[PDB]
Design a protein around this ligand. Structure first.
Ligand SMILES: CCCCCC(=O)Oc1ccc([N+](=O)[O-])cc1
Ligand SMILES: CCCCCC(=O)Oc1ccc([N+](=O)[O-])cc1
Ligand SMILES: CCCCCC(=O)Oc1ccc([N+](=O)[O-])cc1
Ligand SMILES: CCCCCC(=O)Oc1ccc([N+](=O)[O-])cc1
Ligand SMILES: CCCCCC(=O)O
Lengths: 309, 309, 309, 309
């Protein structure tokens, strides 16, 4: 039996007791609401910050809603974190990952801009990617509405947002924004197709993210298996920016993260690979229900400060 | 300050630390999802039963979904428990109270039929009552689809479901079903209007059920203050069936349950009044997070067995 | 016309046909002898028990005679029932309620200690109460002479004894004996002044206990209307022990018992309220003349077992 | 035309202009003195330290010479760095890597114990490994003669010493010393056989370490190709300690270090992979001739501090 932390196991047993409908059995609005409720009850509360401000920027389909987080009311030029939430490209929003964003802003002492990108099935692949790229380019242009100057950008995101992290870094690598990507932080990302992976079979049920949910998200999003914007393991890694890959040992898509970090080493790129032991997918947003995951996030923070130099 | 059990106080501290939005500040589906998560994560797992079966019966608006619970695959004629869930007539469903239902069925060794009645704001007062009454009459008719002959019915429900319990017993008292109500069990019910009561002021915040939530529910359901189907304290108590009223000492609507039991005594009716000390509203569905509440439920069960003979 | 059971009505008709004199018309010795004769006639025969033993304990005015009833010569530690007979504090003794005591001991499988407390007018208020309190404390101390160990006491009594039951529970509540009152069972008690009550007017004549007798007892006992030891509705109910209140629907002091049960609910205390339908005051001691009153006693017994756990 | 830093390229071109003999064309003593003279000229001078002290410990073939470096005469318990020098297992000693050792001790503020292990061809494989393992176990036991307490050990070494670093970590993993390996730092290690690698062909000549020298060292050391103590890529990686792998982009054995870091990710182990751009093998010891390599060492140091927490 795989190792599970005691506080992690208690959370999994409560989810098993709840025994709700699957995502596919709910309406879309119900599925999205259940994710709000899960993170609402499981995550630590928001940090207080000097600046929490809603903005928007132009996108290919229309305006893209954004939210700026900053512990400082005024700050000098520096890197700006551009955050993309998880949720399979189907669920999640600015509120499901709000508390985590306030934590990243507080602990990094850098500004964070979260992207409220368009969701599937209403907006299938590559809608989410289009919006994350556009928003990241916009932040990288130091617009006056943002109120602080970017000397570089730091894409970061969990799961689907970790997929978006890598894709955005590849798109900006090929066609630079006004400043470079100085660091990327894909957190338990989907980089290679998880179908057929050993982690997917081993952790298919009972570890928060299920094989059934992965298939539900896949059916809604409709990413093409040969498209590097859907599966960025297929992209060109030879100029990948400095990278921190964080995975979970109990994640059904753990091996997708392993694959990506291996590909970066194969291409000679600098990478920190951290595989959190005894916790699941989504550990960044369950920091109250599973208190030991706060320490896992803090290790990512420490790696980020190190890699920023 | 009022007495609070240590495990109860730890649960309240967790809720306070979460510092979530009010039900009114969420979308309606987010409010419903937050209740699914509250019970889902805080209650004990379901009992294993011989029979857990979805069914439906005709109602005035269309079909009424039902769920049958029975520890026995087949059984002789006997009383049948008809259960109405809490949630202000706005939230809750068959799943939010599913584990509690399996526990009632296991500990009573009687069949339980839970009612998936229509909810406000989509279906305001008296839609919930219409469906609860219709389902209870249908069970009382011993339909072949149920496979359980009813010698009598036992209305039971928590909070809004405790309101429904009393209204149904009054409606069936006035126009009998095929068999009588042999016992009713309103658990922390709303019987009289809570506005103005001492308990509402004393426990308006910080005790799971809040004054703000009570107001949210009241606005959606739109019960007429003069209608005994809304506030059954106004009804005729002179032929009330044998009753167990269970309240919580920390409940903002505690005094409404006190009022009902006093009205039963005033009318010469047999009643067991149990006020659980140092726990809150909703204690029937938080039996894992607050382990001492399992004993509270078991006291209700013991009183039911006694009052059934 | 109030509902009267057929067997109860026939007994009332026989009493009327015999047309005996009132308590004021008889001599004190004759009144006491007629009470002996009524129960000796009307009640079911005594149960055979291993132990029926006279005892005594020190009191504030000399020794208090007691009678111990137990189905077992030797038993484990457990609650001990402490019984106070009815009779207005003027008539009755250890023999008038002897068969009832044997029935309680047989059906509960607990020891019962009946108190031969001082009677008015020879010994007016508060004599009876002082003796009932002293005897209950003595039993609660597990004295060697009792022959069994008390883990708690259960005060119980009919009418004036129901008054004594509540007063004793309040006095031991304020100044504890060696073990707690774990349950009290006031049976058709006098808790509030019956003067002015609707039940006193409705059942003033022809229902075994008469208005004339109530006034007779009151003149003899001379209880202070403002003293909670005379009228324990005036006492502090906030810490009342678990309670079973039993009344009779045709009792002139029925509303007194209703008042007390209501006051317990108002104070948030656990209480079973049972109002026996279609029978009179004294139903616990007329179980042969009115055979259905045995079932009434058995309902009280069932409630006692439930409330003891 | 692979990228080469300007100061790096100047160093390589001066070496080319000298046109010195190969390792095969020199005597053993000439080769070893040649390496002493290269580092003596090319590396930065020694840091001044409170403690630079020769020690020794028992080994499998007699006493193993050690040298202790510490910026502090007296310190709290903490990890102790155990260092193994490069030189193909044929050349190098405590003096060729002395200045680098003082730098590591100064910048980490941790004690460093360098190992004077037995050299080939006089002592072929596995003599060097045996000595490195024995010395690391000795340090890990916190012997009185060490003068400070080890709470853990940190194996570190360049090239052949990077090979020894990994092998020691595997041996202590299978058979623990008194304290764990808390971090390992293999610097341009030989982990997998370089023969057949793309890096070996691309950088066979002109980049400090030549293919000819690799062959010369290999024939002297005579490591068994199937032995994980000779080629630790063959070892069990499933419990590898936290790791920092540092390589150089112009290193003929660069791909061996890539292979090892990929194998750790594949096994789910935490690893920092740093590939220094535009510098060669041996960059840790040419920090005066190529001043930009001081920054490369400082990046390794920063990663070490981060991974130690
Ligand atoms: C309801 C369980 C958590 C589902 C949401 C979640 O865990 O965030 C994800 C985002 C993307 C992917 N994915 O790309 O398969 C999976 C998960
Ligand atoms: C979010 C916690 C409260 C959830 C709802 C609940 O606890 O069940 C109730 C049902 C009905 C009423 N009511 O009628 O006011 C109150 C509460
Ligand atoms: C002969 C019928 C009356 C016998 C006395 C009786 O039935 O028991 C009572 C005890 C106490 C009170 N009281 O306190 O008013 C009334 C009645
Ligand atoms: C004469 C300068 C190059 C030789 C010294 C050197 O570069 O240190 C090494 C140690 C070990 C290995 N090896 O294990 O192949 C290669 C190189
Ligand atoms: C309203 C204050 C709550 C406790 C007071 C009571 O038990 O009636």
């Amino acid at each position: 039996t795989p190792f599970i932390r005691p506080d992690m196991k208690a959370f999994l047993e409560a989810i098993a007791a709840m025994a709700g409908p699957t995502l596919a059995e709910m309406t879309l609005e119900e599925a999205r609401a259940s994710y709000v409720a899960l993170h609402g009850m499981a995550d630590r509360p928001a940090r207080e910050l000097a600046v929490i401000r809603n903005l928007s920027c132009p996108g290919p389909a229309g305006d893209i809603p954004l939210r700026l987080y900053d512990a400082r009311e005024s700050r000098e030029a520096g890197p700006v974190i551009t955050f993309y939430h998880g949720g399979g490209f189907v669920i999640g929003d600015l509120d499901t990952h709000h508390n985590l964003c306030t934590e990243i802003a507080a602990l990094m002492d850098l500004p964070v801009v979260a992207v409220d990108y368009r969701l599937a099935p209403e907006h299938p692949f590559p809608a989410a990617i289009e919006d994350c790229e556009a928003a990241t380019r916009w932040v990288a242009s130091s617009p006056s509405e943002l109120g602080r100057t970017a000397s570089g950008v730091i894409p970061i995101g969990d799961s689907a947002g970790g997929n978006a992290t890598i894709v955005v870094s590849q798109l900006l690598g090929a066609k630079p924004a006004d400043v470079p990507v100085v660091l990327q932080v894909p957190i338990f990302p989907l980089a290679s197709d998880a179908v057929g992976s050993a982690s997917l079979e081993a952790f298919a049920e009972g570890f928060v993210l299920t094989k059934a949910s992965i298939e539900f998200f896949d059916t809604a999003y409709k990413a093409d298996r040969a498209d590097p914007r859907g599966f960025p393991i297929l992209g060109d890694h030879t100029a990948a920016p400095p990278t921190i890959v964080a995975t979970a040992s109990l994640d059904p898509i753990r091996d997708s993260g392993r694959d990506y970090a291996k590909a970066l080493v194969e291409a000679g790129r600098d990478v920190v690979y951290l595989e959190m032991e005894g916790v699941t997918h989504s550990f960044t947003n369950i920091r109250a229900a599973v208190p030991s995951t706060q320490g896992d996030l803090e290790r990512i923070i420490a790696a980020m400060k190190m890699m920023l130099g």
